[PDB]
Design a protein around this ligand. Structure first.
Ligand SMILES: Cc1cc2nc3c(=O)[nH]c(=O)nc-3n(C[C@H](O)[C@H](O)[C@H](O)COP(=O)(O)OP(=O)(O)OC[C@H]3O[C@@H](n4cnc5c(N)ncnc54)[C@H](O)[C@@H]3O)c2cc1C
Ligand SMILES: Cc1cc2nc3c(=O)[nH]c(=O)nc-3n(C[C@H](O)[C@H](O)[C@H](O)COP(=O)(O)OP(=O)(O)OC[C@H]3O[C@@H](n4cnc5c(N)ncnc54)[C@H](O)[C@@H]3O)c2cc1C
Ligand SMILES: CC(=O)OC/C=C(\C)CC[C@@H]1O[C@@]1(C)CC[C@H]1OC1(C)C
Ligand SMILES: [Cl-]
Lengths: 472, 472
């Protein structure tokens, strides 16, 4: 019969959205969150990635807006900014500067804790959602492997008390992020291991918060230095996004074989050694507000529970636990919104053999293919890249043809409007990566006008005035 | 690599939309249509159903509008009407008259040949679609059976000539309607027979065109008379929709075990023996413009090429040939729009070893599940219904439970606004039928007000003035 009680494990983006949606179809929804959840925008041990820059692409923004009307207006009231792509950015690519064509896509930019709090507020207010903060999921109960295994509940442990308790449920949602022990829990229940694709370029991040020159959060574009020669050299990148409170979030990145700034005095010299020193120039005399924060969670890994015949009934895995991506492309939250979107849209059809949770998990798997195959294609050809994947779209490919086509796509997007719009659709997770091989894109790539090469970064004079620069 | 030439077999609703969509992804697209296609709105031997009432539910209309912008305005320019449900209809159900709540869904109503021509106009004009009229596809070429056979092309026969040239293609789409020889073509090439669910209530139709009282096509609602019972007696129904040209399209229907008006003189007496004589009264002094047209195509059929592992590469089946429904629910065209919509949205992702066509056919099959189980559930329990199906949602269900819930839904839909909106979402193919078992709907069914039972059909006095009637 219908599920009556659902336990969502984890209360970050994936868990929160899935819990809000399940509450519409399930009588009772418990959320099990290890951390205490602040009622003020504040960092916390469970989401350490929140220290680094976070783009909410249009896909995620529009999907969240549909689940939770008013969330965008609430975020912008709080000082968030809607960056239009490519209009509101100064971007250096491997092929040159991006012409700031009129915005055809957008991302919402803000400190991640502000976005998390604003979503929790809109989503977890429901009467039939009980969130148990300071509570840790320890393992899953039930049988597994063979014939017809199912998950019956979850053993949770109060952290402030230390007591343990078995929490029974008809449905269990693992949303415990990239560091999920699902594999451990599954081995405990006697479930055979899952298929796992991995494309790991060894990306790491180093981030500092800065106080921005007055007005730069609204009248100065974001600046991104994303040039790369993947097969010869490890990548080195840098970004400066505006966030709320007149602040600049500056995030530097590299791939395996390169070295990030460990100390504060090494931050600027890394931005100086990029293909253009604009970032070092912008941050030279900005006031630093934090030390350097680091992250090493940059690998593209994807589990395939939809392929496991022994997948236990009543168990779903969403978010970073199901599949996590190279954050340079900023799709983690959008694909979290996708998983909750999919649960909302296939739940009723799936509960009418409990082939309904394996149907849910199958629809969920399809929903996250777009960010997986985008990040895996871009990263697969880096020098030193660790690759362990069965995806035929990656393994049996003529690599030099792949990079020649990669350079063509970038060369078209930076200097031709029709080719730029399609790329932003893919970059904003609103169109599949395969659209860039479509005849439509091939004809835009060939027939559209190509503006001249920008010799200097395309800043408006006003914009250089806001930060006290001119010339290049 | 990508397919280069696609042959769409059939140029009705399914074929035309698929041809327009394939043309966006395929360099060359030929459509093979048996009939000659008129440039003026006219009936034709290939679409004999066009004589009978045709509702374009909101689902189909919005899908067509997105693929072919401007089609809605063109239809209404031609005199079509957008019926708002339930506001613009006078409907008798098994549980009483439907309260004309403000419209929460809509259908486009017009003569089917008018809809056919204006969609062909918007769709087949493309540079890379050549339509060869008066040409019949007779059988398929290629390999087949065992491992992974493929279809190489189609043997076509020029009709005005007697000629018989083979037309090769990378992809072939069977859109030849309910009376397609697909099964013959597949058996000849050695592919095993496909799974087929059928729930056939023996539905037949009898239709007459009438000239409507001046203004009634704009200021008088559609009138729908739907019989109550199913388990004791065959159903007897009638509807009168306004169509373009100040005309009334009147279509009467019954299920197996009843007798339809076969000739002209028993039309009125059949609408006279319905549970309310409003239909016979409305056409008593109207001018009949046609003789009575008949149809016996009322069976719910669903093929499962997504289930056949021996399904030939490069072959797709869409439209009525893939799955056909009891037209009382008016979803055939909406499910055609879905099939081309699904092709358009997963073509690029799937042809990227033709493991892509079997993915397309799986995506298409999912798109047509909603009308299938929306047409099979209502019909499954009719007297005399012949059923041969593997669908667990029909075979393993408590008959009295299905019936008890059916009347509860209708009793709620006719007298409660919140319950009415959800039902119209489902009936207009905008929500899966499983939504009517949702917690959302169950609490709408229980918490929303129930207006008093309507004693008389709910015509406004103004409306009866337009047609010269009064009383009940
Ligand atoms: C450096 C970096 C930059 C990123 N930038 C972007 C970006 O620009 N845009 C974007 O869209 N995405 C970005 N991402 C990805 C994004 O942060 C995640 O995809 C997003 O947070 C969704 O993760 P999640 O909800 O699945 O789990 P997480 O966000 O990782 O959270 C897991 C939650 O589960 C809880 N939990 C864990 N274990 C247990 C347990 N045993 N019991 C109870 N609770 C538990 C944790 O406390 C936490 O609250 C970035 C990621 C990184 C690392
Ligand atoms: C009585 C009745 C009422 C209906 N009412 C509604 C309604 O209210 N709403 C709704 O949405 N749907 C309704 N339908 C269904 C709707 O008519 C169809 O679903 C719709 O026309 C889509 O069909 P199709 O394009 O797949 O094939 P069809 O419309 O049946 O057309 C098949 C085409 O293929 C061609 N063809 C066939 N064989 C060959 C061959 N060997 N070689 C070449 N060409 C060939 C034919 O000439 C024709 O052009 C109704 C159907 C019937 C029978
Ligand atoms: C980096 C490379 O060659 O990999 C292939 C590139 C692909 C598949 C598309 C990515 C776009 O080329 C990028 C990186 C430029 C877009 C940015 O200008 C923005 C701000 C819209
Ligand atoms: Cl991190």
């Amino acid at each position: 019969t219908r599920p009556a009680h659902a336990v969502v494990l984890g209360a970050s983006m994936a868990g929160t959205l899935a819990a809000h949606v399940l509450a519409r179809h399930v009588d009772a929804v418990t959320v099990v969150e290890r951390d205490a959840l602040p009622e003020e925008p504040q960092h916390r041990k469970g989401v350490p990635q929140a220290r680094h820059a976070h783009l909410l692409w249009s896909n995620g923004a529009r999907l969240i807006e549909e689940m939770l009307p008013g969330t965008t207006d609430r975020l912008l009231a709080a000082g968030a900014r809607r960056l239009g792509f490519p209009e509101d950015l100064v971007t250096l690519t491997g092929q040159g500067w991006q012409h700031r064509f009129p915005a055809t896509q957008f991302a919402l930019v803000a400190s991640r804790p502000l976005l998390d709090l604003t979503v929790r507020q809109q989503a977890l207010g429901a009467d039939n959602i009980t969130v148990r903060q300071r509570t840790e999921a320890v393992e899953l109960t039930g049988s597994g492997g063979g014939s017809g295994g199912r998950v019956t509940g979850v053993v949770v442990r109060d952290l402030d008390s230390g007591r343990q308790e078995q929490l029974e449920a008809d449905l269990v949602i693992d949303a415990t992020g990239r560091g999920s022990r699902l594999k451990q829990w599954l081995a405990a229940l006697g479930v055979p291991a899952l298929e796992e694709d991995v494309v790991d370029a060894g990306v790491a991040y180093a981030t500092r918060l800065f106080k921005a020159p007055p007005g730069a959060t609204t009248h100065f574009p974001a600046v991104n230095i994303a040039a790369d020669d993947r097969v010869r050299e490890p990548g080195r990148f840098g970004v400066v996004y505006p966030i709320e409170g007149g602040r600049w979030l500056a995030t530097l990145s590299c791939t395996r074989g390169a070295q990030l700034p460990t100390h504060e005095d090494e931050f600027i010299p890394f931005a100086e050694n990029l293909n253009h020193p604009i970032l070092a120039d912008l941050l030279r005399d900005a006031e630093p507000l934090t030390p350097v924060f680091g992250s090493r969670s940059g690998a593209n890994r994807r589990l395939y529970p939809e392929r496991l015949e022994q997948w236990p009934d009543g168990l779903l895995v969403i978010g970073d636990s199901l599949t996590a991506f190279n954050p340079i492309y900023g799709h983690g939250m959008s694909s979290a919104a996708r998983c909750a979107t999919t649960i909302d849209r296939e739940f009723e059809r799936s509960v009418q053999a409990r082939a309904g949770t394996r149907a849910l998990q199958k629809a969920i798997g399809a929903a996250v293919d777009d960010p997986w195959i985008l990040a895996a294609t871009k990263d697969i050809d880096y020098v030193n890249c660790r690759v362990s994947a069965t995806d035929p779209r990656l393994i049996g490919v003529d690599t030099e043809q792949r990079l020649r086509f990669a350079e063509a796509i970038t060369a078209a997007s930076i200097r031709s409007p029709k080719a730029s719009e399609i790329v932003t659709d893919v970059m904003s997770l609103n169109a599949p990566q395969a659209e860039l091989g479509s005849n439509r894109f091939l004809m835009a790539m060939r027939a559209d006008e190509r503006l001249p090469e920008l010799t200097a970064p395309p800043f408006l004079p006003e914009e250089l005035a806001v930060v006290g620069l001119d010339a290049a």
